[PDB]
Design a protein around this nucleic acid. Structure first.
Ligand SMILES: Nc1nc2c(ncn2[C@H]2C[C@H](O)[C@@H](COP(=O)(O)OP(=O)(O)[C@@H](F)P(=O)(O)O)O2)c(=O)[nH]1
Ligand SMILES: [Cl-]
Ligand SMILES: [Cl-]
Ligand SMILES: [Cl-]
Ligand SMILES: [Cl-]
Ligand SMILES: [Cl-]
Ligand SMILES: [Mg+2]
Ligand code: NA
Ligand code: NA
Ligand code: NA
Length: 326
DNA sequence: CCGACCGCGCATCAGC
DNA sequence: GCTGATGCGC
DNA sequence: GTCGG
């Protein structure tokens, strides 16, 4: 919040570029500036001061000078007044509606929540559940509720098979006092990089959580990734908890550290870390870190016995999860 | 300059 | 049906 | 939009 004015401006510009211009690289450029500035431990006094930071260049520097002098940005003022952009930006807030679908909807004269509700027939399944819980998915989850959700998910998984390990990642693992959703990393000994010795490993867990009415809707579901919706049980006479987004990723057990590194994020931290890896001659995904040969082709998986080994390979000092919130 | 910008699972589609 | 490309989201 | 080579 020290430079919250500026970082908000940049995020709004990032959202415009992604959602309206469908200019993903511009979007990442703005997100990176916002992130580098959000970290900066001083109140920024000028564009020039900002430009010293990596990811802030001439254009962003100029915008920061405008914002500092006036408290706003004319380019944004105009975007906000523009009915087509505003409509498109709005629709992309429904889970399952991206920039392409949002613009297709807007072309058909579907531009508001009212329009979406009356055209459910035009929605795929994901989009439909996104609209259903539109309000709910806007709400943050207090850590206290995440703690109760953890407890249900770990206990239910334990009931299915005591050899499962379920680990809550995302901003929760980074120590955040609230989270946008719940991310669960799942492992079982019978699923490794070498073999899948049991089928339905994810499904059974999903089933048990549906059984006890924790998981209420499914956005998508494959052998290793579940994306859907869950809700804490509420007591007699009390209002229901909001429904919440839940993702569950089943990862080969021998690839736990790469998987927990990935699912811990943040997303920007993952991008930055993977890009540094490339500079160091490695590539990192949620499974492995592999060397790039002279060609630039991934070699074989390097050995990894902790998250710190991954940091070590790319010559970064270890960062605890709570310092990875970029 | 100017190329590169992280890496991937699932749903949905086109084209065979 | 298949594979490959694209959208979307993590 | 920003950056490194
Ligand atoms: N490589 C890579 N990894 C990505 C990306 N997006 C998400 N991830 C990873 C890290 C994130 O913590 C994790 C969960 O993705 P989330 O979108 O849940 O992110 P979180 O850190 O939990 C917070 F945004 P919150 O949910 O609290 O509001 O998934 C991406 O674009 N690239
Ligand atoms: Cl772009
Ligand atoms: Cl503004
Ligand atoms: Cl690993
Ligand atoms: Cl891999
Ligand atoms: Cl931590
Ligand atoms: Mg999350
Ligand atoms: Na800079
Ligand atoms: Na969306
Ligand atoms: Na998530």
């Amino acid at each position: 919040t020290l430079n919250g004015g500026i970082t908000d401006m940049l995020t709004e510009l990032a959202n415009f570029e992604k959602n309206v211009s469908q200019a993903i690289h511009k979007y990442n450029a703005y997100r990176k500036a916002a992130s580098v500035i959000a970290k900066y431990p001083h109140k920024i006094k000028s564009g020039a001061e900002a430009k010293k930071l990596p990811g802030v260049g001439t254009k962003i520097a100029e915008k920061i000078d405008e914002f500092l002098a006036t408290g706003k940005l004319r380019k944004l003022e105009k975007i906000r007044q523009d009915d087509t952009s505003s409509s498109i930006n709005f629709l992309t807030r429904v889970s399952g509606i991206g920039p392409s679908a949002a613009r297709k909807f807007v072309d058909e004269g579907i531009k508001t929540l009212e329009d979406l509700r009356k055209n459910e027939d035009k929605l795929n399944h994901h989009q439909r559940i996104g609209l259903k819980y539109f309000g709910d998915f806007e709400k943050r989850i207090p850590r206290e509720e995440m703690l109760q959700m953890q407890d249900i998910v770990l206990n239910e998984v334990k009931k299915v098979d005591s050899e499962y390990i379920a680990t809550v990642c995302g901003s929760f693992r980074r120590g955040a006092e609230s989270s946008g959703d719940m991310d669960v990393l799942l492992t079982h000994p019978s699923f490794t990089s070498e073999s899948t010795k049991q089928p339905k490993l994810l499904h059974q867990v999903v089933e048990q959580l549906q059984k006890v009415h924790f998981i209420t809707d499914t956005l998508s579901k494959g052998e290793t990734k579940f994306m859907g919706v869950c809700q804490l049980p509420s007591k007699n006479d009390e209002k229901e908890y909001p429904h919440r987004r839940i993702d569950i990723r089943l990862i080969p057990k021998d690839q736990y550290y790469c998987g927990v590194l990935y699912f811990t994020g943040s997303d920007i931290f993952n991008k930055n870390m993977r890009a540094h890896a490339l500079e160091k001659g490695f590539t990192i995904n949620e499974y492995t870190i592999r060397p790039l040969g002279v060609t630039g082709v991934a070699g074989e998986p390097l050995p990894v016995d902790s998250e710190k080994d991954i940091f070590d390979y790319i010559q970064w000092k270890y960062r605890e999860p709570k310092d990875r919130s970029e």
